[PDB]
Design a protein around this motif. Structure first.
Motif, PDB file in Angstrom:
ATOM      1  N   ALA A   5       0.998  -1.246   0.098  1.00 38.43           N
ATOM      2  CA  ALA A   5      -0.055  -0.011  -0.018  1.00 38.43           C
ATOM      3  C   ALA A   5       0.779   1.247  -0.010  1.00 38.43           C
ATOM      4  O   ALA A   5       0.467   2.268  -0.766  1.00 38.43           O
ATOM      5  N   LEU A   6       1.988   1.141   0.986  1.00 39.42           N
ATOM      6  CA  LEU A   6       2.720   2.409   0.808  1.00 39.42           C
ATOM      7  C   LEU A   6       3.528   2.501  -0.319  1.00 39.42           C
ATOM      8  O   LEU A   6       3.709   3.992  -1.004  1.00 39.42           O
ATOM      9  N   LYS A  11       3.698   5.491  -5.773  1.00 39.46           N
ATOM     10  CA  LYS A  11       3.646   5.574  -7.305  1.00 39.46           C
ATOM     11  C   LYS A  11       2.732   6.641  -7.527  1.00 39.46           C
ATOM     12  O   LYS A  11       2.836   7.320  -8.706  1.00 39.46           O
ATOM     13  N   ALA A  12       1.520   6.889  -6.765  1.00 41.99           N
ATOM     14  CA  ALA A  12       0.526   7.978  -7.237  1.00 41.99           C
ATOM     15  C   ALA A  12       1.407   9.315  -7.121  1.00 41.99           C
ATOM     16  O   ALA A  12       1.159  10.046  -7.656  1.00 41.99           O
TER      17      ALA A  12
ATOM     18  N   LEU B  20      11.712   3.580  -7.147  1.00 44.65           N
ATOM     19  CA  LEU B  20      11.750   3.259  -5.577  1.00 44.65           C
ATOM     20  C   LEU B  20      10.675   2.572  -5.285  1.00 44.65           C
ATOM     21  O   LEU B  20      10.397   1.829  -4.588  1.00 44.65           O
ATOM     22  N   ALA B  21       9.366   2.936  -5.639  1.00 44.10           N
ATOM     23  CA  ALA B  21       7.895   2.310  -5.409  1.00 44.10           C
ATOM     24  C   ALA B  21       8.019   1.080  -6.170  1.00 44.10           C
ATOM     25  O   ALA B  21       7.559  -0.021  -5.264  1.00 44.10           O
TER      26      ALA B  21
ATOM     27  N   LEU D  20       5.875  10.024   4.073  1.00 44.26           N
ATOM     28  CA  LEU D  20       5.930   8.538   3.634  1.00 44.26           C
ATOM     29  C   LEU D  20       7.393   7.906   4.005  1.00 44.26           C
ATOM     30  O   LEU D  20       7.491   6.834   4.521  1.00 44.26           O
ATOM     31  N   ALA D  21       8.574   8.693   3.837  1.00 47.51           N
ATOM     32  CA  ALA D  21       9.835   8.222   4.357  1.00 47.51           C
ATOM     33  C   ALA D  21       9.749   8.007   5.772  1.00 47.51           C
ATOM     34  O   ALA D  21      10.234   6.968   6.210  1.00 47.51           O
ATOM     35  N   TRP D  22       9.210   8.930   6.387  1.00 46.87           N
ATOM     36  CA  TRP D  22       9.513   8.558   7.916  1.00 46.87           C
ATOM     37  C   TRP D  22       8.380   7.312   8.493  1.00 46.87           C
ATOM     38  O   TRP D  22       8.814   6.752   9.124  1.00 46.87           O
ATOM     39  N   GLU D  23       7.336   7.413   7.629  1.00 45.70           N
ATOM     40  CA  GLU D  23       6.335   6.064   7.885  1.00 45.70           C
ATOM     41  C   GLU D  23       6.921   4.789   7.595  1.00 45.70           C
ATOM     42  O   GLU D  23       6.813   4.070   8.419  1.00 45.70           O
TER      43      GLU D  23
END
Lengths: 30, 30, 30, 30
Positions: A5-6, A11-12, B20-21, D20-23
């Motif tokens: 999911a992340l 990608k989005a 990266l995704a 997102l990177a921290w996540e």
């Protein structure tokens, strides 16, 4: 596992960045 | 005008984000 | 686990994006 | 000129990338 999911959230954001890059090029051309 | 060059720098970062995704999805699958 | 390294690669790309955004604003102001 | 608005759209995407990177780092630590 949420990793997948992340990776879709990444990608989005990449797609949104590429759209903005095309938008900037069009602004420059005009 | 440098706008077009800055838009290419954006496009390159978007491409790196998408790579990266895909990498994260592969890490998750493995 | 490589997750942490991939998260650093993301952080570096985010920093580069923010630098380009500041650069675009400065181009606009000038 | 819309440049400044497009630069804000970039800044928002950079902020989302850093979040997102921290996540991802937190997911890795857990």
């Amino acid at each position: 596992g949420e990793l997948k999911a992340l990776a879709q959230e990444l990608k989005a954001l990449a797609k949104e960045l590429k759209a903005l890059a095309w938008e900037l090029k069009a602004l420059a051309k005009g």
